CSV table of C-alpha atoms and ligand atoms in Angstrom, one decimal:
chain,number,residue,atom,x,y,z
S,1,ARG,CA,11.4,-34.5,54.0
S,2,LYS,CA,11.6,-35.7,50.4
S,3,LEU,CA,14.7,-36.4,48.6
S,4,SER,CA,13.8,-34.5,45.3
S,5,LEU,CA,13.3,-30.8,45.2
S,6,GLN,CA,10.1,-29.9,46.7
S,7,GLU,CA,8.8,-27.2,44.4
S,8,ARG,CA,5.9,-26.0,45.5
A,5,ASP,CA,-4.5,-13.3,24.1
A,6,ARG,CA,-1.5,-14.7,26.1
A,7,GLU,CA,-1.2,-11.4,28.2
A,8,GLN,CA,-4.2,-11.9,30.1
A,9,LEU,CA,-3.8,-16.6,29.6
A,10,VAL,CA,-0.8,-15.5,31.7
A,11,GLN,CA,-3.1,-13.3,34.1
A,12,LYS,CA,-6.0,-16.3,34.5
A,13,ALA,CA,-2.7,-18.5,35.0
A,14,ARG,CA,-1.5,-16.6,37.9
A,15,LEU,CA,-5.1,-15.9,39.4
A,16,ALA,CA,-5.7,-19.9,39.5
A,17,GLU,CA,-2.1,-19.8,41.7
A,18,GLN,CA,-3.3,-17.4,43.3
A,19,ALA,CA,-6.7,-19.4,43.9
A,20,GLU,CA,-4.4,-23.0,44.6
A,21,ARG,CA,-6.5,-24.4,41.4
A,22,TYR,CA,-3.8,-25.9,40.3
A,23,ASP,CA,-5.7,-27.9,37.3
A,24,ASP,CA,-6.8,-24.4,35.9
A,25,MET,CA,-3.3,-22.8,36.1
A,26,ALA,CA,-1.6,-25.5,34.5
A,27,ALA,CA,-4.1,-25.6,31.7
A,28,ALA,CA,-3.6,-21.9,30.9
A,29,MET,CA,0.3,-22.3,30.9
A,30,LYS,CA,-0.5,-25.5,28.5
A,31,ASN,CA,-2.4,-22.8,26.6
A,32,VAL,CA,0.7,-20.0,26.2
A,33,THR,CA,2.8,-22.6,25.3
A,34,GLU,CA,0.9,-24.1,23.3
A,35,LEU,CA,0.4,-20.8,21.2
A,36,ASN,CA,4.5,-21.9,19.8
A,37,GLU,CA,5.8,-18.4,21.0
A,38,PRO,CA,8.7,-18.9,23.4
A,39,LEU,CA,8.3,-18.9,27.0
A,40,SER,CA,9.3,-15.8,29.6
A,41,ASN,CA,11.8,-17.3,32.5
A,42,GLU,CA,8.8,-16.3,35.3
A,43,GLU,CA,6.4,-18.1,32.4
A,44,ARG,CA,8.5,-21.1,32.5
A,45,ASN,CA,8.3,-21.7,36.4
A,46,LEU,CA,4.5,-20.8,36.3
A,47,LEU,CA,4.3,-23.8,33.8
A,48,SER,CA,6.7,-26.3,36.0
A,49,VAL,CA,5.3,-26.0,39.3
A,50,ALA,CA,1.7,-25.8,38.8
A,51,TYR,CA,2.1,-29.0,36.6
A,52,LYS,CA,3.9,-30.9,39.1
A,53,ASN,CA,1.8,-29.5,41.8
A,54,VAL,CA,-0.8,-31.3,39.5
A,55,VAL,CA,1.1,-34.4,39.7
A,56,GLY,CA,2.3,-34.2,42.8
A,57,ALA,CA,-1.2,-34.4,44.3
A,58,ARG,CA,-2.0,-37.8,42.8
A,59,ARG,CA,1.6,-38.5,43.5
A,60,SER,CA,0.6,-37.9,47.3
A,61,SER,CA,-2.7,-40.0,46.9
A,62,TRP,CA,-1.3,-42.9,44.9
A,63,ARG,CA,1.4,-43.4,47.4
A,64,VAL,CA,-1.0,-43.5,50.8
A,65,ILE,CA,-3.6,-45.7,48.7
A,66,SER,CA,-0.7,-48.4,47.7
A,67,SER,CA,1.1,-48.1,51.3
A,68,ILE,CA,-1.8,-48.9,52.4
A,69,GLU,CA,-2.5,-51.7,49.8
A,70,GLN,CA,0.6,-53.5,50.7
A,71,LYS,CA,0.1,-53.8,53.7
A,72,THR,CA,-3.2,-55.6,54.0
A,78,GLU,CA,-10.6,-59.9,51.2
A,79,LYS,CA,-13.3,-58.4,48.9
A,80,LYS,CA,-11.6,-54.1,49.6
A,81,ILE,CA,-8.1,-55.3,48.2
A,82,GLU,CA,-9.9,-55.7,44.5
A,83,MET,CA,-11.5,-52.2,45.1
A,84,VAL,CA,-7.8,-50.1,46.7
A,85,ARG,CA,-6.3,-52.2,43.5
A,86,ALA,CA,-9.1,-50.8,41.1
A,87,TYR,CA,-8.5,-47.2,42.9
A,88,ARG,CA,-4.3,-47.8,42.6
A,89,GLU,CA,-4.8,-48.2,38.8
A,90,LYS,CA,-7.7,-45.3,38.5
A,91,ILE,CA,-5.3,-42.5,39.9
A,92,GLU,CA,-2.2,-44.3,37.9
A,93,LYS,CA,-3.9,-43.7,35.2
A,94,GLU,CA,-4.1,-40.2,35.5
A,95,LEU,CA,-1.1,-39.7,36.9
A,96,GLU,CA,0.3,-41.3,33.3
A,97,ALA,CA,-2.2,-39.1,31.5
A,98,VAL,CA,-0.6,-35.7,33.4
A,99,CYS,CA,2.7,-36.5,32.7
A,100,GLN,CA,2.7,-37.5,28.8
A,101,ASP,CA,0.8,-34.5,28.8
A,102,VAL,CA,3.4,-32.2,30.1
A,103,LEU,CA,5.9,-34.7,28.5
A,104,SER,CA,4.9,-34.0,24.7
A,105,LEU,CA,4.6,-30.6,25.9
A,106,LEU,CA,7.9,-30.4,26.4
A,107,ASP,CA,8.6,-32.3,22.8
A,108,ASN,CA,6.8,-30.9,20.5
A,109,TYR,CA,7.1,-27.4,22.2
A,110,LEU,CA,9.7,-26.0,24.7
A,111,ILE,CA,12.6,-27.4,23.0
A,112,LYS,CA,12.5,-27.7,19.2
A,113,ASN,CA,12.1,-23.7,20.2
A,114,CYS,CA,15.2,-23.0,22.3
A,115,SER,CA,18.1,-22.1,19.7
A,116,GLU,CA,21.8,-23.0,20.9
A,117,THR,CA,22.0,-19.6,22.9
A,118,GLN,CA,19.1,-20.6,24.8
A,119,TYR,CA,21.2,-23.1,27.2
A,120,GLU,CA,19.0,-22.0,30.1
A,121,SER,CA,16.1,-22.7,28.8
A,122,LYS,CA,16.9,-25.8,27.5
A,123,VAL,CA,18.6,-27.7,30.7
A,124,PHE,CA,15.6,-26.3,32.5
A,125,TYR,CA,13.0,-28.2,30.2
A,126,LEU,CA,15.4,-31.0,29.9
A,127,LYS,CA,15.4,-31.3,33.8
A,128,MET,CA,11.4,-31.0,33.3
A,129,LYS,CA,11.5,-34.2,30.9
A,130,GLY,CA,14.0,-35.7,33.3
A,131,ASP,CA,11.3,-35.6,36.1
A,132,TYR,CA,8.3,-36.6,35.1
A,133,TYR,CA,10.1,-39.9,33.5
A,134,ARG,CA,11.1,-40.3,36.5
A,135,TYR,CA,7.4,-39.9,38.1
A,136,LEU,CA,6.4,-42.5,35.1
A,137,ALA,CA,8.9,-44.9,36.0
A,138,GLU,CA,8.0,-44.5,40.2
A,139,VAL,CA,4.5,-46.4,38.9
A,140,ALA,CA,5.9,-48.7,36.3
A,141,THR,CA,6.9,-52.7,36.7
A,142,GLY,CA,8.7,-54.5,34.2
A,143,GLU,CA,8.9,-53.6,30.6
A,144,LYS,CA,7.1,-50.7,31.2
A,145,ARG,CA,9.9,-49.6,33.4
A,146,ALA,CA,13.3,-49.9,31.8
A,147,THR,CA,12.1,-48.2,28.6
A,148,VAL,CA,11.4,-44.8,30.5
A,149,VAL,CA,14.0,-45.3,33.0
A,150,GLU,CA,16.2,-44.9,29.7
A,151,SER,CA,13.8,-42.1,29.0
A,152,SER,CA,14.9,-40.4,31.6
A,153,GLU,CA,18.4,-40.8,32.2
A,154,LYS,CA,19.1,-39.2,28.9
A,155,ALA,CA,17.1,-36.3,29.6
A,156,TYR,CA,18.7,-36.1,32.6
A,157,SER,CA,22.6,-36.8,31.7
A,158,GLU,CA,22.1,-34.6,28.4
A,159,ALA,CA,21.0,-32.3,30.8
A,160,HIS,CA,23.5,-32.3,32.9
A,161,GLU,CA,26.5,-32.1,30.6
A,162,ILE,CA,24.9,-29.3,28.8
A,163,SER,CA,25.4,-26.9,31.9
A,164,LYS,CA,28.2,-28.3,32.6
A,165,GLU,CA,29.5,-26.5,30.1
A,166,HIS,CA,27.4,-22.9,29.8
A,167,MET,CA,26.4,-22.2,33.4
A,168,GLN,CA,28.4,-22.1,37.1
A,169,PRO,CA,27.0,-24.3,39.1
A,170,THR,CA,25.7,-21.9,41.4
A,171,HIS,CA,22.9,-21.1,38.9
A,172,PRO,CA,19.7,-22.8,40.7
A,173,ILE,CA,18.6,-24.7,37.5
A,174,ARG,CA,21.9,-26.5,37.6
A,175,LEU,CA,21.7,-27.3,40.9
A,176,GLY,CA,18.3,-28.5,40.9
A,177,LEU,CA,18.7,-30.7,38.1
A,178,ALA,CA,21.8,-32.1,39.8
A,179,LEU,CA,19.8,-32.8,42.6
A,180,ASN,CA,16.6,-34.5,41.2
A,181,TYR,CA,19.6,-36.2,39.1
A,182,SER,CA,20.9,-37.7,42.5
A,183,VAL,CA,17.6,-38.5,44.1
A,184,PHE,CA,16.9,-40.6,40.6
A,185,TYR,CA,20.1,-42.3,41.0
A,186,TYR,CA,19.5,-42.8,44.4
A,187,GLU,CA,15.5,-44.0,44.1
A,188,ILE,CA,15.1,-45.4,41.0
A,189,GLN,CA,18.4,-46.4,39.5
A,190,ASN,CA,19.1,-47.8,43.2
A,191,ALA,CA,23.5,-46.8,43.2
A,192,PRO,CA,23.9,-44.6,45.9
A,193,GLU,CA,27.6,-44.9,45.1
A,194,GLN,CA,26.7,-42.3,41.5
A,195,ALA,CA,24.0,-40.5,43.4
A,196,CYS,CA,26.5,-39.8,46.5
A,197,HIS,CA,29.2,-39.1,43.5
A,198,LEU,CA,26.9,-36.1,41.8
A,199,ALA,CA,25.3,-34.8,44.8
A,200,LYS,CA,29.2,-34.3,46.0
A,201,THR,CA,30.4,-33.3,42.7
A,202,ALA,CA,27.7,-30.5,42.3
A,203,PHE,CA,27.9,-29.1,46.3
A,204,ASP,CA,31.6,-28.7,46.3
A,205,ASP,CA,31.6,-26.7,42.6
A,206,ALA,CA,28.6,-24.8,43.8
A,207,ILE,CA,30.5,-24.3,47.4
A,208,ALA,CA,33.7,-23.3,45.6
A,209,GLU,CA,32.5,-20.1,44.1
A,210,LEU,CA,30.0,-18.7,46.6
A,211,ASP,CA,31.6,-15.2,45.0
A,212,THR,CA,29.3,-15.9,42.0
A,213,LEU,CA,26.0,-16.1,44.0
A,214,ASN,CA,23.9,-13.1,42.7
A,215,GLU,CA,21.9,-10.5,44.8
A,216,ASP,CA,18.1,-12.0,42.7
A,217,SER,CA,19.2,-15.9,43.1
A,218,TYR,CA,20.9,-16.4,46.6
A,219,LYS,CA,17.6,-18.0,48.3
A,220,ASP,CA,17.2,-20.5,45.5
A,221,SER,CA,21.0,-21.3,45.4
A,222,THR,CA,21.5,-21.4,48.9
A,223,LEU,CA,18.5,-23.8,49.4
A,224,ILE,CA,19.3,-26.1,46.8
A,225,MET,CA,22.6,-26.2,47.1
A,226,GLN,CA,21.6,-27.0,51.6
A,227,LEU,CA,19.3,-29.7,50.3
A,228,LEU,CA,22.6,-31.3,48.1
A,229,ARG,CA,24.9,-31.5,51.3
A,230,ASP,CA,21.6,-32.6,53.4
A,231,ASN,CA,21.3,-35.6,51.4
A,232,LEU,CA,24.4,-36.3,51.2
A,233,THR,CA,24.6,-36.4,54.9
A,234,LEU,CA,22.6,-39.3,55.5
A,235,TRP,CA,23.1,-40.8,52.3
L,4,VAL,CA,-21.2,-52.9,44.6
L,5,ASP,CA,-21.3,-53.5,48.1
L,6,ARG,CA,-22.2,-50.6,49.9
L,7,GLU,CA,-19.8,-51.3,52.4
L,8,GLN,CA,-16.8,-51.0,49.5
L,9,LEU,CA,-19.1,-47.7,48.7
L,10,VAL,CA,-18.2,-46.2,52.3
L,11,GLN,CA,-14.4,-47.6,52.3
L,12,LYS,CA,-13.3,-46.1,48.9
L,13,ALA,CA,-14.6,-43.0,50.7
L,14,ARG,CA,-13.2,-43.5,53.9
L,15,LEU,CA,-9.4,-44.1,51.8
L,16,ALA,CA,-10.4,-41.2,49.6
L,17,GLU,CA,-10.3,-38.8,52.7
L,18,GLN,CA,-6.8,-40.1,53.1
L,19,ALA,CA,-5.9,-39.1,49.7
L,20,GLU,CA,-7.7,-35.8,49.4
L,21,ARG,CA,-9.8,-37.4,46.6
L,22,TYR,CA,-13.0,-35.3,48.6
L,23,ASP,CA,-15.0,-35.0,44.9
L,24,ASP,CA,-14.2,-39.4,45.1
L,25,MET,CA,-15.2,-38.9,48.4
L,26,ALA,CA,-17.9,-36.9,48.3
L,27,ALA,CA,-19.4,-38.9,44.7
L,28,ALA,CA,-19.1,-42.6,46.8
L,29,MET,CA,-21.0,-41.1,50.0
L,30,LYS,CA,-23.7,-39.6,47.3
L,31,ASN,CA,-24.5,-42.5,45.7
L,32,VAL,CA,-24.5,-43.9,49.3
L,33,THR,CA,-27.2,-41.7,50.4
L,34,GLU,CA,-29.0,-42.7,46.7
L,35,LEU,CA,-29.9,-46.1,48.1
L,36,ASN,CA,-32.5,-44.5,50.5
L,37,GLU,CA,-31.3,-46.1,53.4
L,38,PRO,CA,-30.9,-44.2,56.6
L,39,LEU,CA,-26.9,-43.2,57.4
L,40,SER,CA,-25.5,-44.1,59.9
L,41,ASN,CA,-24.0,-41.5,62.4
L,42,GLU,CA,-19.8,-42.8,60.9
L,43,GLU,CA,-21.6,-42.1,57.3
L,44,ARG,CA,-23.2,-39.0,57.9
L,45,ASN,CA,-20.3,-37.8,59.6
L,46,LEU,CA,-18.2,-37.8,56.6
L,47,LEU,CA,-20.5,-37.4,53.8
L,48,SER,CA,-20.9,-34.0,55.5
L,49,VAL,CA,-17.0,-34.0,55.4
L,50,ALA,CA,-16.1,-34.5,51.9
L,51,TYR,CA,-19.2,-32.0,50.6
L,52,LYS,CA,-18.0,-29.3,53.5
L,53,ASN,CA,-14.4,-29.4,51.7
L,54,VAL,CA,-14.7,-30.2,48.1
L,55,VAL,CA,-17.9,-26.5,48.9
L,56,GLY,CA,-15.1,-24.8,50.8
L,57,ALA,CA,-12.5,-25.3,48.6
L,58,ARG,CA,-14.8,-23.5,46.2
L,59,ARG,CA,-15.6,-21.1,48.5
L,60,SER,CA,-12.1,-20.3,49.6
L,61,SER,CA,-10.5,-19.5,46.0
L,62,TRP,CA,-13.7,-17.6,45.2
L,63,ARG,CA,-13.0,-15.1,48.1
L,64,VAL,CA,-9.3,-14.8,47.0
L,65,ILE,CA,-10.8,-14.1,43.1
L,66,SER,CA,-13.4,-11.7,44.3
L,67,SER,CA,-11.1,-10.1,47.0
L,68,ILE,CA,-8.3,-10.1,43.9
L,69,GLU,CA,-11.0,-9.0,41.3
L,70,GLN,CA,-11.5,-5.5,44.1
L,71,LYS,CA,-8.2,-3.7,45.0
L,72,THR,CA,-7.4,-3.0,40.7
L,79,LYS,CA,-9.1,-3.5,31.9
L,80,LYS,CA,-7.9,-7.4,32.2
L,81,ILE,CA,-11.2,-7.3,34.7
L,82,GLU,CA,-13.5,-9.2,32.0
L,83,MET,CA,-11.1,-12.4,32.6
L,84,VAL,CA,-11.3,-12.0,36.6
L,85,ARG,CA,-15.7,-12.0,36.4
L,86,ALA,CA,-15.5,-15.2,34.3
L,87,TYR,CA,-13.2,-16.9,36.7
L,88,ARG,CA,-15.6,-15.9,39.4
L,89,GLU,CA,-18.5,-16.8,37.5
L,90,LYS,CA,-16.9,-20.2,36.8
L,91,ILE,CA,-15.9,-20.9,40.3
L,92,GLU,CA,-19.6,-19.5,41.5
L,93,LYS,CA,-21.2,-22.2,38.9
L,94,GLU,CA,-19.2,-24.6,40.1
L,95,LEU,CA,-20.0,-24.0,43.6
L,96,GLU,CA,-24.1,-23.7,43.5
L,97,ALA,CA,-23.4,-26.8,41.4
L,98,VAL,CA,-22.3,-29.2,44.4
L,99,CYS,CA,-24.8,-26.7,46.4
L,100,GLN,CA,-27.6,-28.1,44.6
L,101,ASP,CA,-26.7,-31.2,44.4
L,102,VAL,CA,-26.3,-31.7,48.2
L,103,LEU,CA,-29.7,-29.5,48.7
L,104,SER,CA,-31.3,-31.9,46.2
L,105,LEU,CA,-29.8,-34.8,48.4
L,106,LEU,CA,-31.3,-33.8,51.5
L,107,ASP,CA,-34.5,-32.7,50.2
L,108,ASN,CA,-35.1,-36.2,48.4
L,109,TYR,CA,-33.3,-38.6,50.7
L,110,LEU,CA,-31.8,-36.9,53.9
L,111,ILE,CA,-34.0,-35.1,55.7
L,112,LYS,CA,-37.1,-36.5,54.2
L,113,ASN,CA,-36.0,-40.6,56.0
L,114,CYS,CA,-35.8,-38.8,59.6
L,115,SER,CA,-39.2,-39.3,61.3
L,116,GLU,CA,-40.7,-37.1,63.2
L,117,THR,CA,-38.9,-37.0,66.4
L,118,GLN,CA,-35.6,-38.2,64.8
L,119,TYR,CA,-34.3,-35.4,66.5
L,120,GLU,CA,-30.5,-35.1,66.7
L,121,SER,CA,-30.3,-36.3,63.3
L,122,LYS,CA,-32.9,-33.8,61.8
L,123,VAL,CA,-31.8,-31.0,63.3
L,124,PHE,CA,-28.4,-31.9,62.0
L,125,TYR,CA,-29.5,-32.4,58.5
L,126,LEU,CA,-31.5,-29.4,59.1
L,127,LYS,CA,-28.7,-27.2,59.8
L,128,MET,CA,-26.8,-28.7,56.8
L,129,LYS,CA,-29.5,-27.5,54.6
L,130,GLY,CA,-29.6,-23.9,56.2
L,131,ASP,CA,-25.5,-23.9,55.6
L,132,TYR,CA,-25.2,-25.0,51.9
L,133,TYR,CA,-28.2,-22.6,51.8
L,134,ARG,CA,-26.2,-20.0,53.5
L,135,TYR,CA,-23.4,-20.6,50.7
L,136,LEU,CA,-25.6,-20.4,48.0
L,137,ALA,CA,-26.1,-16.7,49.5
L,138,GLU,CA,-22.5,-16.0,49.7
L,139,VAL,CA,-22.2,-16.0,46.0
L,140,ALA,CA,-25.6,-14.4,45.4
L,141,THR,CA,-27.3,-11.5,43.9
L,142,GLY,CA,-30.2,-9.6,44.0
L,143,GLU,CA,-33.2,-11.3,44.7
L,144,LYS,CA,-31.9,-14.7,43.6
L,145,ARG,CA,-29.9,-14.0,46.3
L,146,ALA,CA,-32.9,-12.7,48.6
L,147,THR,CA,-34.6,-16.2,48.1
L,148,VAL,CA,-31.5,-18.4,48.7
L,149,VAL,CA,-31.4,-16.3,52.8
L,150,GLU,CA,-35.1,-16.5,53.0
L,151,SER,CA,-34.8,-20.4,52.6
L,152,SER,CA,-31.7,-20.5,54.8
L,153,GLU,CA,-33.2,-18.4,57.7
L,154,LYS,CA,-36.0,-20.7,57.1
L,155,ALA,CA,-34.3,-24.6,57.2
L,156,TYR,CA,-32.1,-22.5,60.5
L,157,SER,CA,-35.5,-21.7,62.2
L,158,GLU,CA,-37.2,-25.3,62.3
L,159,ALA,CA,-33.5,-26.6,63.1
L,160,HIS,CA,-33.6,-23.9,66.1
L,161,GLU,CA,-37.0,-25.0,67.3
L,162,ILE,CA,-36.1,-28.2,67.9
L,163,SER,CA,-33.0,-27.6,69.0
L,164,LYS,CA,-34.9,-25.3,72.2
L,165,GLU,CA,-37.7,-27.5,72.4
L,166,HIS,CA,-36.0,-31.6,72.6
L,167,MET,CA,-32.6,-31.2,72.9
L,168,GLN,CA,-29.6,-30.7,75.6
L,169,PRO,CA,-28.1,-27.0,75.5
L,170,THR,CA,-25.0,-28.8,75.5
L,171,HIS,CA,-25.5,-31.1,72.9
L,172,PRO,CA,-22.8,-30.0,69.8
L,173,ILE,CA,-25.0,-30.6,67.1
L,174,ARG,CA,-27.5,-27.7,69.1
L,175,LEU,CA,-24.0,-25.5,69.8
L,176,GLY,CA,-23.0,-26.2,66.1
L,177,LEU,CA,-26.5,-24.9,65.0
L,178,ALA,CA,-26.1,-21.8,67.3
L,179,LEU,CA,-23.1,-21.1,66.2
L,180,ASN,CA,-23.6,-21.3,62.3
L,181,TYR,CA,-26.9,-19.7,62.9
L,182,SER,CA,-25.0,-16.6,64.3
L,183,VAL,CA,-22.5,-17.0,61.9
L,184,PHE,CA,-25.1,-16.7,59.3
L,185,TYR,CA,-26.8,-13.7,61.0
L,186,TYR,CA,-23.6,-11.7,61.0
L,187,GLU,CA,-21.9,-12.6,57.5
L,188,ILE,CA,-25.5,-12.7,55.6
L,189,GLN,CA,-27.5,-10.1,57.0
L,190,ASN,CA,-25.3,-7.7,58.4
L,191,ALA,CA,-26.9,-8.2,62.0
L,192,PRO,CA,-24.4,-8.6,64.2
L,193,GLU,CA,-26.7,-7.7,67.2
L,194,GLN,CA,-28.6,-10.4,66.6
L,195,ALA,CA,-25.7,-12.7,65.8
L,196,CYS,CA,-23.9,-12.2,69.1
L,197,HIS,CA,-27.0,-12.4,70.9
L,198,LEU,CA,-27.7,-16.0,69.4
L,199,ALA,CA,-23.9,-16.7,70.1
L,200,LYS,CA,-24.7,-15.2,74.3
L,201,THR,CA,-27.3,-17.7,74.6
L,202,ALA,CA,-26.1,-20.5,73.3
L,203,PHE,CA,-23.1,-19.9,75.5
L,204,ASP,CA,-25.2,-18.9,78.4
L,205,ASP,CA,-27.6,-22.1,78.1
L,206,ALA,CA,-24.4,-24.7,77.3
L,207,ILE,CA,-22.7,-23.0,80.9
L,208,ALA,CA,-25.3,-24.4,83.1
L,209,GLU,CA,-23.2,-28.0,83.1
L,221,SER,CA,-18.7,-30.6,73.1
L,222,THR,CA,-15.4,-28.4,75.3
L,223,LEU,CA,-14.0,-27.0,71.6
L,224,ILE,CA,-17.4,-25.5,70.0
L,225,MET,CA,-18.8,-23.6,72.3
L,226,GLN,CA,-15.1,-22.2,72.8
L,227,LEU,CA,-15.0,-21.8,69.1
L,228,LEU,CA,-18.9,-19.7,69.3
L,229,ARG,CA,-17.6,-18.3,72.5
L,230,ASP,CA,-13.6,-17.4,70.5
L,231,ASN,CA,-16.4,-16.0,68.3
L,232,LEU,CA,-17.8,-13.0,70.6
L,233,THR,CA,-14.3,-12.1,72.2
L,234,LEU,CA,-14.1,-11.6,68.5
L,235,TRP,CA,-17.0,-9.0,67.6
L,236,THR,CA,-16.8,-7.1,71.2
O,2,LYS,CA,-13.2,-19.9,59.8
O,3,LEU,CA,-16.1,-18.6,61.9
O,4,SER,CA,-18.4,-21.6,62.0
O,5,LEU,CA,-18.4,-24.7,62.3
O,6,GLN,CA,-15.5,-26.5,60.1
O,7,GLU,CA,-14.3,-29.4,59.0
O,8,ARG,CA,-18.0,-30.8,60.3
D,301,FSC,C1,7.6,-17.0,39.6
D,301,FSC,C2,7.1,-17.2,40.3
D,301,FSC,C3,6.3,-18.4,40.9
D,301,FSC,C4,6.2,-20.0,40.0
D,301,FSC,C5,4.9,-18.5,41.7
D,301,FSC,O1,7.8,-19.0,41.3
D,301,FSC,C6,8.2,-19.7,40.5
D,301,FSC,C7,10.1,-20.1,41.7
D,301,FSC,O2,10.7,-19.0,40.2
D,301,FSC,C8,12.1,-19.2,41.3
D,301,FSC,O3,12.6,-20.1,41.8
D,301,FSC,C9,12.8,-21.6,41.1
D,301,FSC,C10,12.3,-22.2,41.7
D,301,FSC,C11,11.7,-22.9,43.4
D,301,FSC,C12,12.9,-22.2,44.0
D,301,FSC,C13,13.3,-23.2,44.7
D,301,FSC,C14,12.1,-22.0,45.4
D,301,FSC,O4,12.3,-20.6,46.0
D,301,FSC,C15,12.1,-20.3,47.5
D,301,FSC,C16,13.4,-18.9,48.0
D,301,FSC,O5,12.3,-21.4,48.2
D,301,FSC,C17,10.8,-22.9,43.4
D,301,FSC,C18,9.8,-23.5,42.1
D,301,FSC,O6,10.2,-24.5,41.9
D,301,FSC,C19,11.3,-23.1,41.1
D,301,FSC,C20,10.8,-22.3,39.8
D,301,FSC,C21,11.6,-24.5,40.6
D,301,FSC,C22,13.1,-24.4,39.9
D,301,FSC,C23,13.9,-25.9,38.8
D,301,FSC,C24,13.0,-25.4,37.9
D,301,FSC,O7,12.2,-27.3,37.4
D,301,FSC,C25,11.4,-27.4,35.9
D,301,FSC,C26,15.3,-25.7,39.1
D,301,FSC,C27,15.3,-24.9,40.3
D,301,FSC,C28,14.4,-23.7,40.2
D,301,FSC,C29,15.0,-22.3,40.2
D,301,FSC,C30,14.2,-22.5,38.5
D,301,FSC,C31,14.0,-21.2,40.7
D,301,FSC,O8,14.9,-20.4,40.2
D,301,FSC,C32,11.7,-17.8,42.1
D,301,FSC,O9,13.3,-17.4,43.0
D,301,FSC,C33,11.2,-17.9,43.6
D,301,FSC,O10,11.1,-16.5,43.8
D,301,FSC,C34,10.3,-16.9,45.1
D,301,FSC,C35,9.4,-15.7,46.1
D,301,FSC,O11,10.6,-17.7,45.7
D,301,FSC,C36,9.7,-18.5,42.7
D,301,FSC,O12,9.0,-18.8,43.6
């Protein structure tokens, strides 16, 4: 999905 | 009293009114008292939700703008309108991280410090996502330091199976990939993070396994498709 | 600014969830006193219902948190703040309806008229969802009158399978159930709507139908 | 939800 950390 | 302000923030989180939760957490961090780890996470994810909403909306209404006589002026005005909102919330939390949350951590608080420094790097990266030319370089510098320093710190005081260190490594790798346009360094740091992490899968605590294993897995994933 | 530009603004604001911006642009679109197209009316409804639904959902979770419990003065203040926001947007859409949309409907513009009256009843029911005492009795009476006129025009000059009539009937059932605490009348309204629609759009009737088997 | 949604 998103490359970065999806932090809610 | 902060005892009920944190409860208001939790109620807003339950209510998915992330603006109100970010505001309550902004109040509790402006009270100048140090932040608990769970209050740390409250503020972090509240403000990141708040800015990520505008990030997604900016993405969609600028993608359609790049896809396409009199309406294009209005979509450009709308993109600038929500850009001046994204930058506003970003700088708000950035000065929240500078005036508070960083000056309020001594040398014995490496964890919280690198937490807030990764926050700073993330929000400066979000600022650079919408910056052009002279306005970009500066923040790309201000992110870089705020990232690298953080890295160094917990390369010295906590093992690479900590969820905070792994999350900083992941955000740093995708910062090198997306913004810095350096896939070599991004792949490199992704590898040095994941390998050092799996080398000591013993240290995965009973209360920290989910978070780490997730972040390590996504670091590995990003490493595959690159 | 040209009205088409505002309609595009709110059409793209739906793709960005700026449903506040969508509702604002479409409210200013209604405020030129010219009747709306089917699409424009529908997306105005969508925007306003989305914002009031966010308010409603978080108010419901706050009130449910308020029950199983000190530190409740803050919970009550938060619930009252959400209430104020909700009835603010409700009064906004109601004043839009009364001053612009329901009025620009001729005495036989049947479909659009029953649409707007069902909308009025829906938003008065939303007002009643958080109202107290006699301030609740007045709004449930107003919602009842709106649904009443809408249902009269629904039964007389409309096809019993029209999705607008079916939606009015479904929301009338939900009103009689969740507001008047009369599941008998609600189930009866739903049963009559379904048994008039079976004679000859699909999803919605199943929706009504899905409510039936949920109450039996 | 029990009413008529997104419309
Ligand atoms: C305090 C609870 C709230 C604020 C609701 O969530 C914060 C979360 O804080 C912890 O998870 C953190 C972390 C989250 C995990 C990656 C997701 O947890 C799971 C199992 O999916 C998501 C959050 O964004 C958070 C706090 C972000 C940080 C990041 C710091 O950014 C500034 C570095 C890595 C990560 C660390 C802090 C994780 O420990 C916990 O392990 C989570 O517990 C659960 C149920 O997953 C909790 O939800």
